[PDB]
Amino acid sequence: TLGNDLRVDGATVNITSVNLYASFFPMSHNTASTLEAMLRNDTNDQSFNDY
Amino acid sequence: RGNLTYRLRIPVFLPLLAPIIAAAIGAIPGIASVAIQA
Amino acid sequence: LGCNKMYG
Amino acid sequence: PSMLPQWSYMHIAGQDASEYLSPGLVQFAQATESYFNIGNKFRNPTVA
Amino acid sequence: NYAALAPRQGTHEMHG
Amino acid sequence: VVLDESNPTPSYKPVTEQKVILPTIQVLASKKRRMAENEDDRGAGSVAEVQMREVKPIQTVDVSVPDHSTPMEVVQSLSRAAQVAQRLTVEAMDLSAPVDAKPLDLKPVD
Numbered sequence: 001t002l003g004n005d006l007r008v009d010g011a012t013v014n015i016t017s018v019n020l021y022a023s024f025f026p027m028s029h030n031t032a033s034t035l036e037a038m039l040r041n042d043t044n045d046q047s048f049n050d051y
Numbered sequence: 052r053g054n055l056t057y058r059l060r061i062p063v064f065l066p067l068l069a070p071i072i073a074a075a076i077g078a079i080p081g082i083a084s085v086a087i088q089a
Numbered sequence: 090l091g092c093n094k095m096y097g
Numbered sequence: 098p099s100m101l102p103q104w105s106y107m108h109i110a111g112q113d114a115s116e117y118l119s120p121g122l123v124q125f126a127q128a129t130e131s132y133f134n135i136g137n138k139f140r141n142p143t144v145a
Numbered sequence: 146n147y148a149a150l151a152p153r154q155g156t157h158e159m160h161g
Numbered sequence: 162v163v164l165d166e167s168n169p170t171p172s173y174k175p176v177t178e179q180k181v182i183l184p185t186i187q188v189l190a191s192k193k194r195r196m197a198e199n200e201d202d203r204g205a206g207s208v209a210e211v212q213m214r215e216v217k218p219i220q221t222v223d224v225s226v227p228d229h230s231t232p233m234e235v236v237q238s239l240s241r242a243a244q245v246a247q248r249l250t251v252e253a254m255d256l257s258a259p260v261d262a263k264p265l266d267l268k269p270v271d
Contacts, residue, residue, distance in 0.1 A: 025133060027133070028263070030261045030263065031261070031263035031264060034125075034261075034264040034267055037267075038119060038121055038125070038267055039122070043117060043118065044119050046138045046139060047107065047108050047139055047140035048138075048140065049094075049095060049140055051095065052191075052210070052225050053225050053226060053227050053228050054190055054191045054228060055176075055189070055190055055191070055226070055232065056170075056173050056188075056189045056190075056191065056223060056224070056225045057186065057187070057188055057189070057235060057236070057239055058187040058189060058221060058223060059184055059185070059187075059221070059243050060165055060179070060184055060185050060186075060187070060219050061184045061219060061220050061221075061222070061243060061246060061247065062184060062219050062247070065254065067249065067250060068246045068250065069213060069222075071242050071246045072211050072222060072224060072239070072246075073211055075238045075239060075241060076209045076211065076238070079230055079238060081207065081229055082207055082208075082209050083207050083208070084207065084209075085208070085209050085211065086208055086210045086211065087211050088210060088211070088212050088213065089212075090114055090115065090126055090127065090130070090135075090136035090139075091114030091115075091136065091137075091139040091140055091141035092137045092139070092140065093140070093141055093143040093154075111155075113154070116155070119271055120270040120271050121267035121269075121270050121271040124266055125263070125266055128263075128266070129263075141155055143153070143154055143155065144153045144155075145152055145153065
């Protein structure tokens with residue numbers, strides 16, 4: 001809440017462990033393979049724009 | 052097993068005669084758990 | 090189906 | 098830029114996602130929209 | 146054709 | 162008419178001739194066997210075994226049903242099954258596993 005300089009006030013961050021947690025939809029292997037094959041085509045390109 | 056055994060001599064991918072015979076036997080009300088062996 | 094979300 | 102204009106390669110002034118996606122992919126997305134929602138992964142132009 | 150004016154995506158209120 | 166008369170199993174003896182299906186069907190009874198511990202051991206049971214025999218250049222099937230089953234009903238059912246097998250020897254059977262449903266959405270439209 002104050003614009004105090006935490007660096008001189010004394011404050012440290014000691015990161016112990018960093019992990020990556022991914023969630024996979026357990027879709028059937030057949031439909032997942034079909035979706036992958038269809039999305040590997042050039043016309044099925046995913047487009048994203050920064051808000 | 053049973054005293055009587057029936058024999059069919061059909062003149063003759065995926066086999067179909069054995070499933071057909073199994074389904075026909077299972078259609079009998081008094082017979083259950085048809086076993087297929089080759 | 091697509092999305093058209095953008096500032097402005 | 099060699100094969101397509103940039104406003105078409107980046108879907109800024111091209112066709113809808115219902116028109117430039119594969120018909121099979123469009124059908125798949127509309128069939129699985131209730132629980133997987135592929136729809137927000139594609140962009141459409143919306144020009145003025 | 147009036148589609149040029151339309152943006153390209155690609156009155157019964159009376160009571161007391 | 163009537164090509165094979167081999168009787169692959171010696172323990173079972175024929176009781177009727179190789180009647181033809183307008184394949185051929187032969188009914189074989191079983192010879193005497195060893196002692197049983199008790200009389201309620203032969204017909205006791207309901208499982209039926211359909212044994213497969215090696216192809217003889219024709220295929221032979223050994224179908225064994227429990228005693229209580231009616232011989233006429235068994236013969237008629239076996240004859241109908243043989244007729245069906247002869248007629249049919251498809252896509253309907255393929256539909257019931259290795260055709261899938263969601264994968265059957267790229268090919269129909271693309």
